[PDB]
Chain A
Amino acid sequence: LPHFIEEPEDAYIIKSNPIALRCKARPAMQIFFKCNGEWVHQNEHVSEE
């Protein structure tokens, strides 16, 4: 199964500075975010191979 190397850590927004969430897993071909029950739009995701 895919093993997470960098699990996303709970972020805190300070002075309206948008802080992104990191996610890294191996072996992985697709990694997506499910924020509050629903899938996040494809445009918001930034993948690194």
Chain B
Amino acid sequence: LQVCLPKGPTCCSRKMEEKYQLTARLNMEQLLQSASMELKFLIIQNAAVFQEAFEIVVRHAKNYTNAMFKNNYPSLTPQAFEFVGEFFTDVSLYILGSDINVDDMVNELFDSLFPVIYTQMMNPGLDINECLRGARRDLKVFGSFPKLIMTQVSKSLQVTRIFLQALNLGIEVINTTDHLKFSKDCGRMLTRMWYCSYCQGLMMVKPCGGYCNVVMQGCMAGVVEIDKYWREYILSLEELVNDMENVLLGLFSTIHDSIQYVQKNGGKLTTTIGKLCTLSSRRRELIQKLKSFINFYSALPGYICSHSPVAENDTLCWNGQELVERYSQEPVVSQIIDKLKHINQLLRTMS
């Protein structure tokens, strides 16, 4: 035998020992999944809810901008609907983590907005379109309005994007916990602690609490080191929650004022161009529920021993090799800690 230390005779062969090892693997993975399920479902639910809530906010803001275009500038529709839809589509794509340039969103918005303003509002009456698009930026027709919107929306959209990325990475590490493969030495120690008693012909004998403690602190030496970074992750997320609804909803007022500003200099502009051409409650409840799991990695071996059958009295128990009266007495983890360090730096730099 290579796991079961044969002190007397033995009722199990090498193949039964391999079966016990695989059942030990399955039992450990199931215990980790049961430990991580509540927190995993919490973060998954909140990620989904916040995603839907942000999409609702973006849709409502696009609807409000379209409605104020319908009401105040009917001459700009239906072209106004095209560039508003493209703008808020790129907004949502940026919120959901896609490579979108915020400055490019605002600049394409004003680039599309200026030619229809010139053709329908200032000089009523397809190839000359690009000359107007160039003149928009060359003559700075919109003044400081584009940079104002640029900073106003970049500030909120970056914090929202990093909030969603942080939720997703928390899901990732919590998903990794229950798929953490362990050492072979730990496999043999778990097999001895849970099953090798059956090879010696014992039916209901449980391992000693102290033996479970030494085994668990033996193979979770790496996993426990994640606790510092997980605590810093929780606290940095708390730092970030302490923003985007008001900005996207005031966008229509800002754009309306910018259109007024451009119409203010129409006299010179037409001649020159003719010649030239409950959310905050949710994130608060999420952080208050997430702070209940700050001890997750430090309490994990305690969970494995308190949910595995053990003799807490440490009397008439299995010590891994014999029935005693009293008890005598990683690459994936590195990746988890690396991504936690990265997301924590990103969080702290944001707030």
CB distance from A18 to the nearest CB of B (A): 10
Contacts of A16 in B (CB 8 A): 78, 81-82, 85
Q: How many A-B residue pairs have CB under 8 A?
A: 5
Docked Cα-Cα span, A19 to B33, in Å, equals 52
What is the size category of the interface that chain B forms with chain A?
Answer: under 10
Query: Which residue in chain B gives the minimum CB-CB distance to A15?
Result: B82
Complex CA gap A16/B81 in Å reads: 9
Grouping DSSP codes into helix (H, G, I), strand (E, B) and loop, the A interface class, with mixed when no group exceeds half, is: loop
Cα separation A15 to B126 with both chains bound (whole Å):
13
Interface size on A, residues (CB 8 A): 2
Q: Taking CB as reference atom, which chain A residue is nearest B78?
A: A16
Bound complex: CA of A29 vs CA of B82, how far in Å? 39
The complex places the Cα of A15 from the Cα of B78 at a distance, in Å, of 10
Q: Complex Cα distance A16/B66, Å?
A: 14
**Chain A residues numbered 1-48 whose CB sits less than 8 Å from any CB in chain B:** 15-16
Q: Which residues of B contact A15 (CB under 8 A)?
A: 82
Q: In the complex, A16→B85 CA distance in Å?
A: 10
Nearest Cβ in chain B — how far from A15, in angstroms? 6
Q: In angstroms, how far is the closest chain B Cβ from the Cβ of A7?
A: 30
Contacts of B81 in A (CB 8 A): 16
Report the separation of the CA atoms of residues A24 and B85 in the bound assembly, to the nearest whole angstrom.
34
Instruction: Give CA–CA (A25, B78) in the complex, Å.
Output: 35
| Cβ–Cβ < 8 Å partners of B82 in chain A | 15-16
Chain A residue nearest to B81 in the complex (CB):
A16
From residue B252, how far is it (CB to closest CB) to chain A in Å?
19
In the complex, A43→B78 CA distance in Å? Answer: 23
**Complex interface bits, B13-39 against A, C-beta within 8 A gives 1, otherwise 0:** 000000000000000000000000000
**Chain A's nearest CB lies how many Å from the CB of B85?**
7
Residues on the A chain within 8 Å of B85, using CB: 16
| CB contact list, B316-336 vs A, under 8 A | none
Q: How far is the CA of A15 from the CA of B83 in the complex (A)?
A: 9
- Residues of A contacting B78 in the complex (Cβ-Cβ under 8 angstroms): 16
Chain B, Cβ-Cβ closest to A16: B82
Min CB distance, A16 to chain B, in Å?
Answer: 5
Docked CA distance A18–B295 (Å): 57
CB closest residue in chain A, given B82: A16
Q: Mark B72-87, 1 if CB is under 8 A from A, else 0.
A: 0000001001100100
A5 to chain B, nearest CB (A): 34
A9 to B250, CA, bound (A): 42
The smallest beta-carbon distance between B199 and chain A, in angstroms, is 60
For the complex, what is the distance from the CA of A46 to the CA of B118, rounded to whole Å?
Answer: 37
Residue ranges of A at the interface with B (Cβ–Cβ < 8 Å)? 15-16
Question: Can you spell out 5 A-B residue pairs with CB atoms less than 8 angstroms apart?
Answer: A15-B82, A16-B78, A16-B81, A16-B82, A16-B85
